[PDB]
Amino acid sequence: PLFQEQMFSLLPVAPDFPKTDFAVSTTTDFVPSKGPWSTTCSEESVFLRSFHTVDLEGKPIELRVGKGGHLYSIQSAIGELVPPQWRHANHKTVSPWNDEVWQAVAVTSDPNKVFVHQSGCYVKPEEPPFYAPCLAQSWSQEDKTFTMLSWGIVPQVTSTLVSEVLYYTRYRFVAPGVVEVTSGLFDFGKRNYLWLNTPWGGVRQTALGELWIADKSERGTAKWLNPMPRFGAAHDGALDSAGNTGGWMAFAEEGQDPNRYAMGLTFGRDVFPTTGMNSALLPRDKTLIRFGQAGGKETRNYIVAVVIPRLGVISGHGVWWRYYMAFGAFEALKKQCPDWADKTSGGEMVVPSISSETRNFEKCIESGVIPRDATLGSDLSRSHVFSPWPKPEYVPVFAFQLKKDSTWVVTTDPSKYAALGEKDSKGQELYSVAMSFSEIRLLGFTSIS
């Protein structure tokens, strides 16, 4: 009870805004999203919980957060705003709500270039999709705040790396049509993940076909990117630094109605305080924003959007990034995005030095969190003490149900139990958490030495 929420004491305190009067309901009972979709995979496999709220005009809108914490569905007044997850001919792998969705990404290159998603895996057409399971979640109706924890997932079913990134996600409905997303990225491994996406995403093109970038010197205005960029051209007109903008971007309907539907995404003007901050968690120049059309309009249906911040994660450390999303009429979205852009900042997820609640392996069994037949992973013992947040040099204590024999094991070494025994064509060890674990549970953190 108190242990479970102390897991979320790692993310920064939510900024204290004066509350507004509007309704928001939440459900974890799956009903099919209408969203016209291009994948036949079961949305129930990725659905975790929905949010029925309103937009800037008081009109209904539904947000569906995936099992890992990613935003994969927006049902607005004009329709779905997340790309339909389209497969190009015989791509031989399908991307079911694990790529073209609003999610956090951590990219490492220490052993090899291995991505880590908040959502899930690319799978074969006949393969059952896999998604990062929700390790812990919490809802507060009075604060309209959803706080959850998940384990990062390498998007390849089999890879050379087991993801060493935990994702702290929070959704705060702060205004009619303004959602606050605070992403927490913690690296509990020994290598680093310097490249981050806070967030990776984009919108469905047939819904919002206009690409707008806020003007640098006129508050509340944006420039229409009429040379409709293409993601991949990169610096060739499909990239801008945060300091060269007004701190936000907009995806508006194709038309001249000033009150057509639009979606706002803030990223700040790169004025967030950097002195007074660990330097290795600022590996890059400044915040980058890449955008543009990908694939065909009526097929891929994806105007890309990604905020690559100046932040990165290293071993035993964690950073955070708080941004905002707006939904509603373009005119009203343009006048309120500036204030939320000035609130977009970030820093390090500092470990709280205050005391915490503690759990044992035996204490997890008596609480029913893990079954009585569970064993320890030979790296643990009864004297080990589980903690809600990663103190310096702490590693997550996992509870795995292996697909090999349905047995339960509690360990902090997921690299041992998902090892496939196969070899990379070069000569590296292959792993797969999707083909090894039936259930993934997090008991907390502890030190091994």
What integer value in Å does the Rg equal? 21 Å
CATH architecture of the largest domain: Distorted Sandwich
Number of E strands: 26
> Which structural category do the helix and sheet elements fall into?
mainly beta
Q: How many domain modules?
A: 2
The CATH topology of the largest domain is given as Beta-galactosidase, Chain A, domain 5
The CATH class of the largest domain turns out to be Mainly Beta
| Number of DSSP helical runs | 4
- How many angstroms separate the termini? 29 Å
Pattern of helices and strands: HEEEEEEEEEEEEEEEEEEEHEHEEEHEEE
Shape: globular
The percentage of residues in β strands lies in 35-45%
Assembly state = monomer
Q: Fraction of residues in helices?
A: under 10%
**Main sheet characteristics:** 10 strands, antiparallel
Characterization of this structure:
It is a single chain. The protein has 449 residues and is mainly beta. It has 2 domains: 347 residues, Beta-galactosidase, Chain A, domain 5, CATH 2.70.98; 86 residues, no CATH class. 6% of the residues lie in helices and 36% in strands. It has 4 helices and 26 strands. The strands form 5 sheets. Strands 7, 8, 9, 10, 12, 13, 15, 16, 19 and 20 form a 10-stranded antiparallel beta sheet that branches. Strands 6-5-11-18-17-14 form a 6-stranded antiparallel beta sheet, with no helix packed on it. Strands 1-2-3-4 form a 4-stranded antiparallel beta sheet, with no helix packed on it. The longest helix is centred in the last third of the chain and has 13 residues. The two termini are 29 Å apart. 49% of the residues are buried. It is classed as hydrolase. The entry lists the keywords Endo-1.3-fucanase, GH174, hydrolase. The assembly is monomeric.
